Amino acid sequence: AQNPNCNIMIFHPTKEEFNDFDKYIAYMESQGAHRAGLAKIIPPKEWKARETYDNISEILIATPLQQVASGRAGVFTQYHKKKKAMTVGEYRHLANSKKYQTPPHQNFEDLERKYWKNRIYNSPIYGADISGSLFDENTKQWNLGHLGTIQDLLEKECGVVIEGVNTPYLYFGMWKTTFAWHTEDMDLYSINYLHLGEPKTWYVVPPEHGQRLERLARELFPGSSRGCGAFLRHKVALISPTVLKENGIPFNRITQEAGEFMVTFPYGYHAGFNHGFNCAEAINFATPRWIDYGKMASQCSCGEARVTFSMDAFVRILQPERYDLWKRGQ
Amino acid sequence: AQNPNCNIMIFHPTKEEFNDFDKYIAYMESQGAHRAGLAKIIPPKEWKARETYDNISEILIATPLQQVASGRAGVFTQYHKKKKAMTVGEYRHLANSKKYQTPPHQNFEDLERKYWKNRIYNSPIYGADISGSLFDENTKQWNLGHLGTIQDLLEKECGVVIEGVNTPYLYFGMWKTTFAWHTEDMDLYSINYLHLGEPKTWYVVPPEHGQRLERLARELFPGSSRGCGAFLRHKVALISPTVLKENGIPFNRITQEAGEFMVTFPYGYHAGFNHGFNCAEAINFATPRWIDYGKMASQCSCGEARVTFSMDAFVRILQPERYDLWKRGQ
Ligand SMILES: O=C(CCCc1ccccc1)Nc1cnccc1C(=O)O
Ligand SMILES: O=C(CCCc1ccccc1)Nc1cnccc1C(=O)O
Ligand SMILES: [Fe+2]
Ligand SMILES: [Fe+2]
Ligand SMILES: [Zn+2]
Ligand SMILES: [Zn+2]
Numbered sequence: 001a002q003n004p005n006c007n008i009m010i011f012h013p014t015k016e017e018f019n020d021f022d023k024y025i026a027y028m029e030s031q032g033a034h035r036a037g038l039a040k041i042i043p044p045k046e047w048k049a050r051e052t053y054d055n056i057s058e059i060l061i062a063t064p065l066q067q068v069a070s071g072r073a074g075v076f077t078q079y080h081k082k083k084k085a086m087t088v089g090e091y092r093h094l095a096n097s098k099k100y101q102t103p104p105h106q107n108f109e110d111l112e113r114k115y116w117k118n119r120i121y122n123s124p125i126y127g128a129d130i131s132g133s134l135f136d137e138n139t140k141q142w143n144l145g146h147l148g149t150i151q152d153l154l155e156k157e158c159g160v161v162i163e164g165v166n167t168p169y170l171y172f173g174m175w176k177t178t179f180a181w182h183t184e185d186m187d188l189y190s191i192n193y194l195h196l197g198e199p200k201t202w203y204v205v206p207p208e209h210g211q212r213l214e215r216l217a218r219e220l221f222p223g224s225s226r227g228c229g230a231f232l233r234h235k236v237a238l239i240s241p242t243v244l245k246e247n248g249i250p251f252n253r254i255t256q257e258a259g260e261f262m263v264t265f266p267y268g269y270h271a272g273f274n275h276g277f278n279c280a281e282a283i284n285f286a287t288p289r290w291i292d293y294g295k296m297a298s299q300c301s302c303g304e305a306r307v308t309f310s311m312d313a314f315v316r317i318l319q320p321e322r323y324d325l326w327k328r329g330q
Numbered sequence: 331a332q333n334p335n336c337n338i339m340i341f342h343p344t345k346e347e348f349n350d351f352d353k354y355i356a357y358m359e360s361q362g363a364h365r366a367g368l369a370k371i372i373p374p375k376e377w378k379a380r381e382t383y384d385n386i387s388e389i390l391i392a393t394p395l396q397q398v399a400s401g402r403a404g405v406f407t408q409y410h411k412k413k414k415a416m417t418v419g420e421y422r423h424l425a426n427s428k429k430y431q432t433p434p435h436q437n438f439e440d441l442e443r444k445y446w447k448n449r450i451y452n453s454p455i456y457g458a459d460i461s462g463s464l465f466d467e468n469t470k471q472w473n474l475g476h477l478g479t480i481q482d483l484l485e486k487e488c489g490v491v492i493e494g495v496n497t498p499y500l501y502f503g504m505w506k507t508t509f510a511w512h513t514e515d516m517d518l519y520s521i522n523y524l525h526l527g528e529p530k531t532w533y534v535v536p537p538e539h540g541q542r543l544e545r546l547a548r549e550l551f552p553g554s555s556r557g558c559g560a561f562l563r564h565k566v567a568l569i570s571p572t573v574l575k576e577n578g579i580p581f582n583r584i585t586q587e588a589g590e591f592m593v594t595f596p597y598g599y600h601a602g603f604n605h606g607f608n609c610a611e612a613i614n615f616a617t618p619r620w621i622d623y624g625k626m627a628s629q630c631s632c633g634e635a636r637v638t639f640s641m642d643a644f645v646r647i648l649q650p651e652r653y654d655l656w657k658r659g660q
């Protein structure tokens with residue numbers, strides 16, 4: 001068994017190795033990368049996502065989300081309050097303002113301490129889930145807008161043609177903007193490229209221990225748990241590394257910097273925060289190894305969790321028994 | 331299963347919890363601490379090993395050992411060259427001299443980098459394995475000179491009375507002084523208290539993965555491996571964290587500071603280095619759970635490894651089949 005401690009692995013593909021996405025994901029897994037639930041990939045020195053980021057101020061964030069916290073410092077829920085549209089130029093200026101800017105800090109460790117101590121007392125604004133891409137059309141390797149689709153993977157493995165098209169999303173962040181504990185829709189993989197700006201810190205639980213996190217979550221958020229058997233799908237629940245330690249939940253942490261890829265693996269619970277103004281791009285993907293996770297994925301049928309048009313087909317084909325109840329749920 | 335990632339756990343016993351050594355070791359293990367191979371224990375704020383360290387300059391280091399390296403930066407062997415006796419006062423002055431002092435550095439991470447890059451190009455002097463204790467006679471808790479003996483544990487578990495008496499050892503360190511990869515004699519536990527001075531960085535492999543380290547060691551030190559089936563017992567072999575990563579060996583690292591205890595668990599391979607002038611005290615101990623490790627411990631019978639008077643009895647009772655060949659070995 002490779003990577004039995006489930007450590008987060010960091011990869012440095014050569015230009016040649018960076019030419020076949022599926023092959024390299026399979027290679028990473030042959031080294032046990034998936035057992036951590038998250039891997040970092042540093043692209044070849046000669047590679048670039050696009051020429052410059054000089055002309056991105058005019059992107060619209062149609063619905064910025066103010067992330068409002070309830071609970072205690074290390075155990076809280078966050079709800080998203082919709083705000084008026086703003087351009088990325090306006091957003092960046094807001095992120096850099098005295099009210100929202102990254103505070104003085106010694107290092108990543110000091111900033112993490114400040115995040116968990118102080119996060120709940122501020123309400124940062126997140127420009128999340130914006131359909132689009134910042135990869136140059138001519139970028140041929142690891143272009144998140146040119147990956148093979150989940151629908152084609154499911155067709156290749158199961159011999160069934162289905163509707164749907166999955167495309168990338170942009171995320172414009174500032175200090176304290178947060179992603180709550182979750183696995184991907186249908187326990188898919190995700191790939192995240194940090195285009196520019198300040199770092200993003202990640203926490204992850206190994207897939208083999210995901211049910212331990214779920215059990216702790218039910219204990220820590222009893223109301224939410226009664227409401228929905230898969231409430232973590234709502235992406236509202238935060239639990240600090242201190243609280244995870246106290247409860248013996250195995251986990252790992254790593255900081256992603258601009259120019260680096262992170263891949264999350266099937267059923268790898270993850271959460272994190274942004275250090276300051278930044279922009280990331282992400283998309284879900286699948287491999288043959290995902291199919292069995294897709295079949296076993298928990299579903300929110302309470303109506304809260306956002307269902308994409310594409311997920312109908314995944315549930316319909318992989319989870320026919322669950323399909324009706326899930327459908328009437330939302 | 332507690333601590334399935336085999337993370338090094340840090341404990342903060344209260345004064346009340348610090349009153350029963352065996353009980354607290356058992357508690358730590360009930361939380362899965364042993365799976366890492368190493369745990370840190372921070373004593374209660376009210377506890378002290380002794381009043382001051384003002385009067386320790388007159389301790390004699392009868393045989394200081396100059397640690398001379400051969401091999402490459404990340405894979406080397408060290409031999410111990412005997413030097414003339416010196417007092418701890420003289421040793422401390424040598425450790426603080428321009429030739430031997432800790433170099434300027436940003437943090438522990440920068441110093442670790444410097445250690446592994448530069449260790450082989452210098453020959454620091456180690457005052458190791460000095461029989462004695464710096465615990466005050468009146469220190470009633472976690473006094474390493476007042477622990478129950480291995481001989482009494484073996485008697486309590488196996489009903490056999492044996493000769494021998496195990497006592498503590500002092501270690502006077504300076505920058506770059508090194509302990510090579512090893513498990514304890516008879517795969518016993520050890521406890522190490524850092525009395526004073528600069529830190530000690532530890533690396534450890536989880537006991538469940540010890541044979542992976544051994545296999546890599548045989549590959550990296552082929553000559554030594556041919557010479558002795560348990561050559562790591564010689565305590566001469568160093569392998570850097572970079573090399574361990576490259577070869578997929580699961581391991582963890584932690585830095586011990588003055589006033590802190592480290593416990594190594596049965597068959598937990600460990601290695602490390604001192605940051606600067608310091609003084610540690612250590613002793614081996616046993617629990618009921620050790621007996622089965624004692625029975626399976628590998629032995630050096632090539633004559634190189636130092637056998638204590640006490641180990642005869644352990645091998646004689648726990649490994650009667652191996653006893654003859656081991657005895658003629660040394
Ligand atoms: O889920 C999110 C943003 C939150 C989406 C959401 C949740 C609830 C309500 C509205 C929007 N973001 C990520 C997820 N997984 C990995 C990384 C991120 C990220 O923010 O870079
Ligand atoms: O083994 C040693 C010192 C080397 C003993 C030795 C080896 C070979 C030849 C002479 C002396 N030291 C430790 C072992 N295990 C944990 C910690 C230490 C330590 O130096 O604090
Ligand atoms: Fe995600
Ligand atoms: Fe040791
Ligand atoms: Zn729900
Ligand atoms: Zn030997």
